[PDB]
C-alpha cells in the first residue's frame, strides 16, 4: 500500500477473508486494522503514500464485510481533527485531488455519526462537543472567531460528505443524517457569530475574508441538507431550514447595514447563495426568494460593477455535480487560505 501500487477488490477480499475463518476478534480483522493504521499514518504525514493509494484506502473503508468501520470508530476523532485543520491539504501537497479525500473522510465520519445517533446522539456530543455548545457569553473574540469558523467548516464538510453518501447510495432505508435536525438551530447561532463579528475583525488577514465564503458555503450546504432530508421523508426538515434562515437573514441584513461599501462582496455570496439553490431547484428557494429579492433590490444602489446584472439575470442528477463543484471550491479556498496565512 505504502511504497508499491495495488488494486482494490483484492484488498477488500483479503480483509473479508481474514474476517472469516477466525475466532478471536484480535485476529479477525488484523489486516483491516493494518489497513486502517496505514491510512492513519498517511493522514498523519509520516509516510509517502501515492494519492491513488490514498483514494483506494478511503474507498475500501467506505465500502465496509471487512470490519474497517469498527477500526475507524476508534480514531474518528483523529479523522475529524485532520479534516478541521486548514493546513492539512497544503502539508499533504508536500508529499486538486485532496478535497475528494476530505469528502471521503467526511463520509466515513458521517457514517460513524450516522451509527451513533440512535435516541441518544452519543456520537454527536462525543465527537462534536461544541455542536450544542455555542460560544460562551456570545463574545466576538478573535480566537473564538477562528475556532467557530473552523467548527463551521467542519460541519460543512460533514454535511457535504453525508450528502455525497446519500446521493451515491440513496437506496438505503436509513439516510446518513449525522447532524440532528433540531440541532441545526444551535448551528445557526454559530453562523451568526461569524457574521456579527465580521466587520470588526475581518481585515487582520485574508483568511478572515475567505471565512465569508466558508460561512455562506456552509449555509447553502445546510439548506441543501434540509431539502434532501425533507424529500427523503417532512415538516421537521423544512421547518428547521426555515428557522435557520429566519435566524441568519437578520444577521446578513445587519452585516450589509454595517458597511455600505463592502456590501458588494457580501452581496456576491448572497447572490451566489441563490445561484446554488438555482442549481438545486429547492422548495425553500422558491419559498424564500420573494423576500430574498428585496434584500439585494434595496441594495442595488450600492452595487459596484455587475451585481445588479446578476440580480436581474436571476430575477426570473445535477445534485452530484453541484456537490462536486462545492467540494472543489471548498478545497481550493482552504488551500489558498493556508497559503496566504503561511506568511
Amino acid at each position: 500500500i505504502q511504497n508499491a501500487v495495488f488494486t482494490l477488490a483484492y484488498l477488500v477480499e483479503l480483509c473479508g477473508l481474514c474476517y472469516r475463518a477466525f475466532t478471536k476478534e484480535r485476529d479477525k480483522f488484523y489486516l483491516s486494522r493494518s489497513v486502517v493504521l496505514e491510512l492513519l499514518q498517511a493522514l498523519k504525514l509520516k509516510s509517502p503514500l501515492p494519492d491513488t493509494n490514498l483514494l483506494l484506502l478511503v474507498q475500501f473503508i467506505c465500502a465496509d464485510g471487512t470490519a474497517a468501520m469498527e477500526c475507524i470508530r476508534q480514531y474518528v476523532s483523529e479523522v475529524l481533527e485532520f479534516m478541521a485543520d486548514m493546513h492539512t491539504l497544503t502539508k499533504l501537497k508536500s508529499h486538486t485531488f485532496g478535497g475528494h479525500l476530505k469528502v471521503g473522510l467526511a463520509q466515513i465520519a458521517a457514517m460513524e455519526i450516522s451509527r451513533g445517533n440512535h435516541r441518544d446522539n452519543k456520537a454527536v456530543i462525543r465527537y462534536l462537543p461544541w455542536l450544542y455548545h455555542p460560544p460562551s457569553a456570545m463574545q466576538q473574540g478573535p480566537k473564538e472567531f477562528i475556532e467557530c469558523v473552523s467548527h463551521i467548516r467542519l460541519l460543512s464538510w460533514l454535511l457535504l460528505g453525508s450528502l455525497t453518501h446519500n446521493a451515491v447510495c440513496p437506496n438505503a432505508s436509513s439516510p446518513c443524517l449525522p447532524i440532528p435536525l433540531d440541532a441545526g438551530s444551535h448551528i445557526a447561532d454559530h453562523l451568526i457569530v461569524i457574521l456579527i463579528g465580521f466587520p470588526e475583525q475581518s481585515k487582520t488577514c485574508v483568511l478572515h475574508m475567505c471565512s465569508l465564503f466558508h460561512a455562506f458555503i456552509f449555509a447553502q450546504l445546510w439548506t441543501v441538507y434540509c431539502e434532501q432530508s425533507a424529500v427523503a421523508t417532512s415538516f421537521t426538515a423544512i421547518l428547521t431550514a426555515l428557522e435557520f434562515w429566519s435566524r441568519v437573514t437578520p444577521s446578513i441584513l445587519q452585516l450589509m447595514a454595517h458597511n455600505k461599501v463592502m456590501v458588494e462582496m457580501v452581496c456576491l455570496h448572497v447572490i451566489s447563495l441563490m445561484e446554488a439553490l438555482q442549481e438545486c431547484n429547492s422548495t425553500i428557494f422558491v419559498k424564500l426568494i420573494p423576500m430574498w429579492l428585496p434584500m439585494i433590490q434595496s441594495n442595488t444602489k450600492h452595487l459596484s460593477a455587475g451585481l445588479q446584472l446578476r440580480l436581474q439575470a436571476i430575477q426570473n442528477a445535477a445534485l452530484r455535480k453541484w456537490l462536486q463543484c462545492t467540494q472543489f471550491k471548498m478545497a481550493q479556498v482552504e488551500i489558498q487560505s493556508s497559503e496566504a496565512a503561511s506568511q
Binding site: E227, T240, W245, S246, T249, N281, P290, S298
Partner: protein
C-alpha cells in the same frame, strides 16, 4: 429597517416548535399595516413606513403574511383547536384578505404554492362576517394567475394535496377550452409517485388535450413523445379508464405512426425491468392468458428480449422469481397470441442476416464479404434466452427446424440455430433443465421428449427429401470454403451435419431420459 421588524415577527411562525408568540405577531400586523396605527413601534420603523408609499409596503410585506397564514393553517392539528378558527388565525386571515383586496409575480407564485394544498382547510362556512370578502379569493380556489400555478407545478418537491388541486384546476380550465408547458408540467408531476385519483385526472387531461393541437402529423422536445410516455406511465399505474387509455393510445399512434414505434423502442431501454414488464402486464393482461397491442408488442419485444438476455445472470439467479415468472408468462403469451413477432425475434439471427424478407421467409416456410457476425450473435443470445424461458421443446417449431436445412439465411447462422437446439437438448438430457422448471415438471419433461421426437421426425423427413478446367474451379471452390465469408458456401453437407448433431442429441436424450 422594515425587513428587520418583518423577519422578527415572522420568526415566531417560522419556528419548528410551537410557542406563545404568534398572537402578538397577528395583533401587530393587524394594528400596524392594515389599520394604520404605529403605536408601540420604534422610531426607525416609524420613519421607514412613512418613507415609502403604503401600497409598496403592502406588496413588500405580503410574502410574510402569506407565509404566516400558511404555516398557521397547516398546523391546525399542532395547535389542537380544529373545531373552529383561532382568534389569532382569524386576525391573520382578515389581515391577509385586507392586503390582497383592499415582482408581484413572485408573490403570486408564493401564494399559489402556499395555499394550493391549504385551500380545502378553508371552508365557505368558516368565513365569518369579517371574512365575507375572502369568498371572492377562496371560491375560485375550489375549482393569468394560472401561469404562476403552472410555474409552481414544476417543483420536484411539492405536497400531494397541492399537486392534486393544481391538476384539478387545470383539468377544469381545459374542459371549457374545448400550451405545451401544461403537458411539461403534468409530465414532471407524473415523474414521481402517482395516486389513482391523480392518475385518472392525468388521463382525462391528456385525452382532452389531444383535441387541442399536439403534433399534428397526419401526413422530450416533441410533444408526441411526452404524451406517449405519460400514457405509458398511466397504463402502468393501472376499469373503464383502461379503455379510455387504449383509445387515447390508438389516437396517438394514428397521429405519429412512425414515431410511436421508435418511442416504444426507446422506452424499452429507458426504464428498468419491473416497469416495462408491469406495463406489458397492464396492456396485454396476460395474467389470465388464453389493434395497437400488436404494434406495441412488435416494437418492444425484440429490444425487451435483448435487454433481458443482456442481464440473464442477474435476473433468475437473485430473488427475482416474481419478475422472472412474469417475464416467462409474457413470453408464452406472445408466443401463443402474437406469433409472427415472436417468430421474428426468435429467428432474429436469421432475419438480421440476408419488411419483405420476413414475408419471403414465411412463404418458404409454408412451402415447407464477411457475414454480419454481430447480428448473428445478438440473434443467438435472444434465441438462447427464449429457449431458456419457454417450455422445453416448444421453441422452435419442427417445421422451422426442417426448413432451416434450406433457407435464405447464412449457413453459419442456421448451423448456429441447429447447434443451440442441440446443446439445449443435451442439457435437458443431463438433467440441467431450465432453472424455472427445477408433478408439473414431469408433464413438462414428457412433453419435451415428445416435442424432441417431433423435431427429429421433421428433420429426418427433410433430410430424406434432400438426399433424394473444371478440376481447377473445383479445387478453387474447395480451398476457400470460409463459412464466415458467405457466397462461397450456400450458392450443404456441413449444415446437414449440424442438423445431424441436433438429431444425435435428440437420440441420446430419448435413449436415456425418456426411457427412464
Amino acid at each position: 429597517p422594515i425587513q428587520t421588524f418583518l423577519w422578527r415577527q415572522t420568526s415566531a411562525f417560522l419556528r419548528p416548535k410551537l410557542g406563545k408568540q404568534y398572537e402578538a405577531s397577528c395583533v401587530s400586523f393587524e394594528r400596524v399595516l392594515v389599520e394604520n396605527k404605529l403605536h408601540g413601534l420604534s422610531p426607525a420603523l416609524s420613519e421607514a413606513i412613512q418613507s415609502i408609499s403604503r401600497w409598496e409596503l403592502v406588496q413588500a410585506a405580503l410574502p410574510h403574511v402569506l407565509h404566516c397564514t400558511a404555516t398557521l393553517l397547516s398546523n391546525r392539528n399542532k395547535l389542537g383547536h380544529q373545531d373552529k378558527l383561532g382568534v389569532a388565525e382569524t386576525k391573520l386571515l382578515h389581515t391577509l384578505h385586507w392586503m390582497l383586496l383592499e415582482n408581484s409575480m413572485a408573490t403570486v407564485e408564493l401564494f399559489v404554492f402556499l395555499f394550493a394544498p391549504l385551500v380545502h382547510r378553508i371552508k365557505e362556512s368558516d368565513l365569518t362576517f369579517r371574512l365575507a370578502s375572502g369568498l371572492v379569493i377562496w371560491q375560485p380556489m375550489w375549482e393569468y394567475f394560472d401561469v404562476a400555478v403552472l410555474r409552481c407545478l414544476l417543483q420536484p418537491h411539492w405536497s400531494e394535496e397541492g399537486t392534486q388541486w393544481s391538476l384539478m384546476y387545470y383539468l377544469q380550465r381545459l374542459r371549457h377550452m374545448l400550451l405545451s408547458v401544461v403537458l411539461k408540467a403534468v409530465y414532471l408531476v407524473l415523474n414521481h409517485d402517482i395516486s389513482s385519483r391523480i392518475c385518472d385526472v392525468a388521463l382525462n387531461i391528456v385525452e382532452c388535450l389531444l383535441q387541442l393541437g399536439v403534433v399534428p402529423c397526419v401526413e422530450p422536445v416533441s410533444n408526441h413523445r411526452l404524451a406517449l410516455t405519460m400514457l405509458i406511465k398511466i397504463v402502468k399505474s393501472l376499469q373503464v379508464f383502461r379503455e379510455n387509455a387504449q383509445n387515447c393510445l390508438t389516437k396517438l399512434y394514428k397521429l405519429d405512426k412512425i414515431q410511436f414505434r421508435q418511442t416504444m423502442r426507446d422506452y424499452v431501454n429507458k426504464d428498468s425491468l419491473n416497469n416495462v414488464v408491469d406495463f406489458l402486464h397492464a396492456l396485454l393482461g396476460f395474467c389470465m392468458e388464453p389493434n395497437v397491442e400488436g404494434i406495441i408488442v412488435g416494437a418492444m419485444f425484440k429490444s425487451l428480449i435483448t435487454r433481458c438476455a443482456s442481464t440473464t445472470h442477474e435476473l433468475h439467479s437473485p430473488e427475482n422469481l416474481g419478475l422472472y415468472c412474469d417475464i416467462r408468462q409474457l413470453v408464452q403469451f406472445i408466443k401463443e397470441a402474437h406469433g409472427n413477432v415472436f417468430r421474428r425475434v426468435a429467428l432474429s439471427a436469421l432475419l438480421d442476416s440476408a419488411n419483405l424478407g420476413r414475408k419471403d421467409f414465411w412463404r418458404k416456410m409454408f412451402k415447407s464479404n464477411v457475414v454480419n457476425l454481430g447480428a448473428i450473435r445478438q440473434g443467438m443470445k435472444r434465441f438462447q434466452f427464449l429457449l431458456n424461458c419457454c417450455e422445453p421443446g416448444t421453441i422452435p417449431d419442427a417445421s422451422i427446424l426442417a426448413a432451416a436445412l434450406d433457407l435464405e439465411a447464412p449457413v453459419v447462422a442456421r448451423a448456429a440455430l441447429f447447434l443451440e437446439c442441440a446443446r439445449f437438448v443435451h442439457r435437458c438430457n443431463r438433467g440441467n433443465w431450465p432453472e424455472w422448471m427445477k408433478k408439473r415438471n414431469q408433464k413438462l419433461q414428457w412433453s419435451a421428449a415428445k416435442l424432441f421426437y417431433q423435431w427429429g421426425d421433421a428433420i429426418g423427413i427433410r433430410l430424406n427429401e434432400l438426399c433424394h478446367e473444371t478440376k481447377r474451379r473445383l479445387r478453387k471452390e474447395d480451398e476457400e470454403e470460409d463459412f464466415l465469408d458467405d457466397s462461397t458456401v450456400n450458392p450443404p453437407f456441413a449444415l446437414k451435419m449440424a442438423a445431424c448433431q441436433l438429431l444425435l442429441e435428440i437420440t441420446t436424450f430419448l435413449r436415456e431420459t425418456f426411457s427412464c
